[PDB]
Scaffold this active site. Structure first.
Site: not given
Ligand SMILES: CC(C)(COP(=O)(O)OP(=O)(O)OC[C@H]1O[C@@H](n2cnc3c(N)ncnc32)[C@H](O)[C@@H]1OP(=O)(O)O)[C@@H](O)C(=O)NCCC(=O)NCCS
Ligand SMILES: CC(C)(COP(=O)(O)OP(=O)(O)OC[C@H]1O[C@@H](n2cnc3c(N)ncnc32)[C@H](O)[C@@H]1OP(=O)(O)O)[C@@H](O)C(=O)NCCC(=O)NCCS
Lengths: 422, 247
Positions: A24, A214-217
């Site tokens: 993502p 990366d939008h998870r981190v």
């Protein structure tokens, strides 16, 4: 026409793009002034040309700024992975910077590869430039190993070479961010305007920089603050002092400021005061010492009269035209040309003091001969200077060898005295 | 240095971002003049200062305009779901507006949360402002319930506070659109010019607004028309009469 299997490096590129679908991603875009970069780059490349060195580029400068920014905001270096079937954050040991190099092959098809500069967080600008040029050089000769393609933590790309304004690229697995550099040019609504008109108004050039993460981190606020830091560094006094110090350039860097109105004391008056200051006090910053040595207990004179800020001028006046009253045998000139001539006459290898003389004809004689410059010598003359230098040094060495203990008061260090007296 | 498991609110953020991969998204971008906003905001804040009231912000004004625009173009409020294994369009009862609030925590790590203002299509500017400030106030004191995080139909974010020009964000499951507000400033080719010169020429300030939507239920033309309506309202006589009357 027809179908054909993908083979080779292209099959690898295809497979990685397919894997990358499971990241993502989000993007941030910011636009920045670019005037000071053009100015200060030109100053550095002039120094290198005289010293028969190389050339620096915009990517070198933006690269170095990017490294400093990642140090200030460490979260931009992290990545994501699932280990033992649990979500995990990965915090690396070093900042390894990947460069996207477009290299044609023997066949005639272009392919893009990403090579790494390793352990970047313990480098100064001199070290950084060397490492950069090493990677690029070996890539053209086709001598990159497998270790050079591993361990990348953050990437840099330059689509602005072709003239693209900005892009939204793909992020590859194992990284947290990719940074993109767009075209450095006037906006398209001014691409038909005249140089004269642009100079009058005070219109500058742009650069657009992007960040894909990366939008998870990584969160949005972190990405925004990262770009804000990069914007501050590229217009900062202390940043350009580092670069100038490392490349051995003797002048103060051009500073960032707003354009000022032509009110009160006219700007022609200010340019004439600058000419007078260099003629009078330019010897204080001339390159006359063979050593890079400043004696610790001696006072350093004030030389604030030699920078354009003290006379209320700015980078925005460099391409404007002024009345100079016969300087350089011309009635009119730009501030860029004025500075160039003054620096060539009063700040290189000869420093001169003559403005204290009371007679006008004496002053004019010296001023005319000192601004014409030193004439280029012939080959016979050059060989004669080399013969005299050789004689001096050789004589000293002979006596050293044949009579060791004996006192002679040597001239070693000052052998140019012999051609001066001659 | 090394590996460490994700725990807490961060694990929830990670899981939602992974789920959101199953939404096809597209984006629209539009730039608008911003002079009248600066002028009229100053006039309102002068009145409040004399009456020992508060302060309004740009997000309040853009928020209210956004609500009016969604009323004019109802398709922007819909979402998608598969029910009984058939594709389905979902049309909600109300317009619930989510605000993206960046709040630091006790530990020292920032986290973003989305809280909701409910039943917005039956509010005037006075009511709207109160509800907005209520959500923000309780968020800082750490007194938000579980009901405040549920039922969002459309979201608003402000990356222009830091100075970003525009962004392309992620859309979370259960919604149809997310709207983003960029920096309100002169363009970068005029950031060195003098005030005198800018006044002579007649150069104004910009704002860039974005729309990110789910393409299974919203078309491009609808998204474009939505942004065109917002652009008209922020430069309209009748719009500013409402705000002035209410304050
Ligand atoms: C020779 C070297 C030192 C760079 O030299 P360079 O001339 O500054 O760089 P290029 O040849 O790529 O650029 C050619 C011209 O395009 C200009 N240019 C490059 N990128 C630009 C951009 N984003 N916007 C505007 N102009 C740009 C350069 O300024 C140069 O113009 P000039 O005539 O004023 O010098 C060397 O590093 C090189 O050739 N590198 C190319 C490969 C590379 O860097 N790849 C990785 C990039 S991430
Ligand atoms: C106090 C409150 C009424 C807002 O006050 P505010 O000062 O207008 O807002 P902020 O403190 O966030 O902004 C500080 C400054 O940034 C400016 N600013 C904010 N967003 C901006 C943008 N997109 N572009 C340019 N400037 C912006 C504001 O105008 C203000 O400048 P000022 O000195 O001229 O007043 C209150 O609602 C608040 O603090 N909110 C912050 C949290 C929030 O609104 N989150 C949700 C956003 S979707």
């Amino acid at each position: 026409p027809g179908q054909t299997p993908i083979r080779g490096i292209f099959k690898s590129i295809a497979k990685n793009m397919d894997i990358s679908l499971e990241i993502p991603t989000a993007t941030s875009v910011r636009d920045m002034p670019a005037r000071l970069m053009f100015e200060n780059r030109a100053m550095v490349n002039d120094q290198l040309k005289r010293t028969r060195g190389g050339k620096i580029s915009f990517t070198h400068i933006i690269g170095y700024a990017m490294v400093k920014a990642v140090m200030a905001h460490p979260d931009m270096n992290n990545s994501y992975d699932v280990i033992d079937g649990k979500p995990t954050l990965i915090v690396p040991e070093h900042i390894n910077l990947g460069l996207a190099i477009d290299l044609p092959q023997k066949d005639g098809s272009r392919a893009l590869v990403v090579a790494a500069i390793k352990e970047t967080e313990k480098m100064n600008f001199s070290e950084f430039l060397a490492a950069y040029e090493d990677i690029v050089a070996r890539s053209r000769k086709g001598k990159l190993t497998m270790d050079d393609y591993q361990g990348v933590t953050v990437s840099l790309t330059n689509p602005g070479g072709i003239g693209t304004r900005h892009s939204v690229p793909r992020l590859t697995k194992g990284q947290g961010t990719i940074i993109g550099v767009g075209s450095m040019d006037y906006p398209a609504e001014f691409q038909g305007a005249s140089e004269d008109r642009l100079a009058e108004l005070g219109v500058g050039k742009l650069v657009t920089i992007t960040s894909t993460y990366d939008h998870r981190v990584i969160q949005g606020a972190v990405s925004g603050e990262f770009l804000r830091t990069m914007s501050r560094l590229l217009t900062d006094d202390s940043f350009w002092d580092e670069i100038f110090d490392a490349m051995n350039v003797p002048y103060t860097p051009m500073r960032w400021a707003q354009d000022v109105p032509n009110t009160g004391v006219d700007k022609n008056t200010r340019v004439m005061q600058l000419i007078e200051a260099y003629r009078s006090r330019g010897h204080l910053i001339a390159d006359t010492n063979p050593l890079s040595w400043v004696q610790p207990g001696m006072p350093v004179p004030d030389h604030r009269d030699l920078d354009i800020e003290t006379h209320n001028l700015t980078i925005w006046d460099l391409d404007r035209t002024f009345n100079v009253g016969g300087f350089g045998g011309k009635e009119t000139m730009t501030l860029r040309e004025v500075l160039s001539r003054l620096r060539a006459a009063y700040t290189l290898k000869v420093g001169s003091e003559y403005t204290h003389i009371l007679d006008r004809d004496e002053r004019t004689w010296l001023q005319d001969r000192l601004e014409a410059g030193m004439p280029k010598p012939t080959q016979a003359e050059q060989k004669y200077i080399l013969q005299k230098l050789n004689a001096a040094e050789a004589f000293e060495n002979f006596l050293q060898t044949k009579y060791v203990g004996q006192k002679r008061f040597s001239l070693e260090g000052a052998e140019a005295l012999i051609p001066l007296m001659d």
